[PDB]
Point group: C6
Chain length 230, copies 6
Amino acid sequence: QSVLELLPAVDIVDGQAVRLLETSYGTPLEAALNWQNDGAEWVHMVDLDAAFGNNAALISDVVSQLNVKVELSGGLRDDESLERALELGVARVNLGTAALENPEWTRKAIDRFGDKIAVGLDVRGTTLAGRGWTKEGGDLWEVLARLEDAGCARYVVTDVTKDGPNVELLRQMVEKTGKPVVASGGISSLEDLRVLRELVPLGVEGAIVGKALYAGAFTLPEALDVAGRR
Amino acid sequence: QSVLELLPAVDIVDGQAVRLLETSYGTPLEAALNWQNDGAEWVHMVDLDAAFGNNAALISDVVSQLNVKVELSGGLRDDESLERALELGVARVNLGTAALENPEWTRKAIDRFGDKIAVGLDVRGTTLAGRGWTKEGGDLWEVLARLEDAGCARYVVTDVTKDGPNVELLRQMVEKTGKPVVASGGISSLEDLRVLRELVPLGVEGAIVGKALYAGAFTLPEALDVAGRR
Amino acid sequence: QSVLELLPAVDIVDGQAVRLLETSYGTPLEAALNWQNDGAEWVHMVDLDAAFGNNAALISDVVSQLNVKVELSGGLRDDESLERALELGVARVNLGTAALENPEWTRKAIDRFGDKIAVGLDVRGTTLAGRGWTKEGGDLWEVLARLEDAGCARYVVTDVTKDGPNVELLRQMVEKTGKPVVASGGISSLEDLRVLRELVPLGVEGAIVGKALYAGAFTLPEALDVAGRR
Amino acid sequence: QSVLELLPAVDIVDGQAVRLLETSYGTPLEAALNWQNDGAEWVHMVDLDAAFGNNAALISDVVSQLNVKVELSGGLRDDESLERALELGVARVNLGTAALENPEWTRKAIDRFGDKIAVGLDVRGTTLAGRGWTKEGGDLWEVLARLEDAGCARYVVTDVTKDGPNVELLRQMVEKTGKPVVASGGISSLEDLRVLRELVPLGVEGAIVGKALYAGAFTLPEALDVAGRR
Amino acid sequence: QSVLELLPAVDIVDGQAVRLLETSYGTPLEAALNWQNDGAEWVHMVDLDAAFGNNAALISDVVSQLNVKVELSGGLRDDESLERALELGVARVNLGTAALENPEWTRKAIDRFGDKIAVGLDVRGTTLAGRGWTKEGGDLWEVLARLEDAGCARYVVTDVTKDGPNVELLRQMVEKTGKPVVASGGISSLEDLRVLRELVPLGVEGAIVGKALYAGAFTLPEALDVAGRR
Amino acid sequence: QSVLELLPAVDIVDGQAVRLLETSYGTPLEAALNWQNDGAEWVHMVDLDAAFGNNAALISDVVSQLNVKVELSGGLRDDESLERALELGVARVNLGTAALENPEWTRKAIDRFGDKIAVGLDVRGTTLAGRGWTKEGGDLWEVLARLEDAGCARYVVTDVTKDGPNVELLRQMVEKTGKPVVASGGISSLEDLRVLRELVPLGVEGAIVGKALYAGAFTLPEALDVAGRR
Ligand SMILES: [Cl-]
Ligand SMILES: [Cl-]
Ligand SMILES: [Cl-]
Ligand SMILES: [Cl-]
Ligand SMILES: [Cl-]
Ligand SMILES: [Cl-]
Ligand SMILES: [Cl-]
Ligand SMILES: [Cl-]
Ligand SMILES: [Cl-]
Ligand SMILES: [Cl-]
Ligand SMILES: [Cl-]
Ligand SMILES: [Cl-]
């Protein structure tokens, strides 16, 4: 059975990161090291300071001192922020809002950096998240169409609903694009990982895991045993 | 028996939050996680720094890493503050003073954001709280009348007296508006939760809990057993 | 026997407060919570940062999360400082030096805010404390006369001598004014609390307690048993 | 036998103070409280931040919450610094260098504030300490002559040599002035306290103690038993 | 058998450094001391703050208080940064990107400072790492050719791939240059150290070790036993 | 046998100092106190913040509260820095680079302050350390000649090589100058202290100790037993 990659979360907030052992804080390195110690191949690192930051050295420490691969997201919205992030040596970045608000910029980024770029999409069902005073979340399939035309290598789809994984949506995206899709959200137990691993032959590549870890539904080693060991 | 939702409090003060285990401080995530671990569906998060702040990343961490829903209040007084708060992805916000001092702004907010907006009212009996040099707390029923005309989805009524829950007031508001009302204050024991849960069929939706928790009157699991488990 | 109210001290210094368990520091909330846990009805909170500060959020946390009533003092010397303090929702404030240096301002404050205002007087015997290069402590009875004409609701008299409670002075003030008087200083043992409680029928309302607590002369529960439980 | 007062040292450095239990740091209040707990009547508090500072709130906390009397020194060199220090309510201050470099200012201070002012003199044998590029330590007896003419109430003489107490010098000063003299330095054992206590009838009032405490030569209770209990 | 030198890593990030005992943070001195305590001759110190800083005093502390030799890298990109680093007294520095982007500057540095200068090259296989919007990693052998013409004393080759040591590349560089080469990356077990030590007679001088230490593959004493004890 | 004075090191770095008990950080006072507790007469205090700072209060605390004598070095390079350091009351200072780069200034300092001034010389064998872009370490004997003409009271010679004590150099300097010389570096065991103590009759006065302490070669009490107890 083909392996479902896991990307346990590391959130950088006020220049530190929670680590799940109970909880403690410390550096992003210590949080990512905890996951590596458990058998992780990847971490999904979100720089929340940058998103809403000067954590470049903290991020570079993770890249330089750990074997785990870093997928970095948060505030990668313009030429300077993107170039600086890639200069840190991370394995991959995720673009988010601006990549959908600035489609030509996203295309320019994909053209230049190729498989180092993935695009994140936050969804409630099949609706894109986000509502401001004058802006609304666009049409998911119209957005996907633009990214596909740009040759986006990889999609990260985060279900943000609070009210299991959306298999139908993940299926539709893998079929429209023929690209790897990474799922996030909708995971409450190891059974949800089983459900996602059944989709690996269809193109679901991996899952970001975080909420279920902090909720104590399972540990990372338990998740890796279910998702698959390479 | 219909369930009374509980919204245990998390107060962000100097960029940290007390957690009740004895007390310790740490991040808002750790405080909200403690409640989630106890079975909470919601937390009522007050950004006191913003009210009297740059806690956006701390708040986003809670939203992103926890299953608990966040009702966010504190300093949501103008277009920028409101839009920024909603951009954090929180389930709901509460407006307070400005929403009563700027009725047209409140109406504009309700029109645009709908059920993401609730309005908080601080009361002593049936008098609105607040006295300045030249401003006084307005007429509770005149204020409610304006909010009802605006189509406010939900009210959060906090009894600030220090001298049980005001059943008569909560009854009157649910009947005037036909909207859900969340109670805060006047809770000293589990019996007060019983009293409030009897009002769920009349439209009392939930209770914010905080004072009684810190006073040791009960624990959150004990409260949830009384208020109801879904 | 009529109860003598106790107002155990909480001093906010560099944005933190000592807590007496040995001593430890933490937030003003944790200090006030310790007293509440012991049975306190009130705390006497002094913002020393403001007096000699941006502790508004820390103070609001105490008001919002605790059942104990807060009597707040420190740097309440002008329209802005006073209005901001009252906006925090505290039960009562104490004015100090400026209230005696600006009698018309004090009168204006008393007229507007009524029983939310008490005035603190520091004394050595019957002499008002304070000596600068060009200013001296005024005449205690001349100052009291002005406050009485203004209708001051309540006096807090702090004996600052270091060289038991001054029963004669407290008696004279209760008789001149017919107002409640709160005593501070001159307490070295539980017997001093007995002495003060005998004055409750004459108008001594309460005692601030602090020095004797830190000196280990008694604990707060021991003091409350002597002063009276409501 | 007349009692020799002890004034154990508290040094405020970077807004904190070492406490001798081993050593730990914390607030000036906690350091002064440790001495009070041991039976101290006085502490000799040096604000080193001010000397070489905004510790006003920390100092006021000590004054307000402790029974121990504070003798405050450090950076009290001009009208503003002196007035601010006295406004903190401390029992006594010590003037140092400026009081000898600005004799008329010192006289003005003594005239206004009387027994709240003592003057500190640092000595090596009978030579005043201090050598700059263009300034030298003046003549001890010529300096004393000016202070005596000014009516200085009290002298604090600190022996700064590192190469027992100088009984002859302390004798000469008490006889020239008829004023109380407080000794500091030259104390290596309890016997040195005995030597100093024999001088109490001649006018040596007290000793600052610090070096011997940190050196472990004795504890404060042991010192108080030797110096005398009132 | 000729000894392979080990250069265990110390990364200075936010003015502190992780130490591997589990992990803890503290000063760069404490991290380097841990390695020295284990038998290290060298540490490879990276100032990540400078790279992406004012850690000069922290670095000087290591140089001054420890017997271990420091190889310092990070942000040594111009005349001022280089001169300041060498003024700290470190045994050796490593130049990185600028040394390849500014070949004449690198030559000037090598000419002046000789064997105090080594040049670091980050590689994926035989491709130089780094891709920006308009800049790409140059040709490894063309870069090496320029450094050889400049008389570069020593090369530090870091394999940054995440997808054993590259013996062929290390062989080619030692043969092209006749200079010592230090390897970094590609070490997952003690066997990889054996592989590298076999290359010591060919000119591989040492290995930086870090990833494998934090991964728990071996301890530093275990590594030193394999690499060789002098 | 004449005693060899020991001057255990205290390095002030980021306003704190490592203390060797394992290691911990705290204040310079706590570090110097540890040495005093072990029997030290002197500490050699280096203000690395000043060298590469506002540690004046921290330094004054050491001087004022401890019996140990302080030899202070670091950044004493000009009239203001030197005068300020001496105003802290330290027993002695060491001048370093500027004293050799500004010989007339050094002479002016020696003329004014006499035996309070010692000059530090960093050496590799008999070569003065330091190489910049345009400056080189001068000729050791030519530098010494200038200092001797100036009447320098004392020399501190630090061997900075990393590749026992240099008896020949220390001998030559004591004979050229007839002044006390303090050695630093080249100490790996108690035997090296024996070697240095044999030179006391020739004019070697003392040794700074630090590297060997942190390396665990001996403890300070063990060193004092070897160097001599007065
Ligand atoms: Cl990576
Ligand atoms: Cl998850
Ligand atoms: Cl939420
Ligand atoms: Cl409650
Ligand atoms: Cl209150
Ligand atoms: Cl008291
Ligand atoms: Cl006092
Ligand atoms: Cl002493
Ligand atoms: Cl080095
Ligand atoms: Cl490694
Ligand atoms: Cl000294
Ligand atoms: Cl040494």
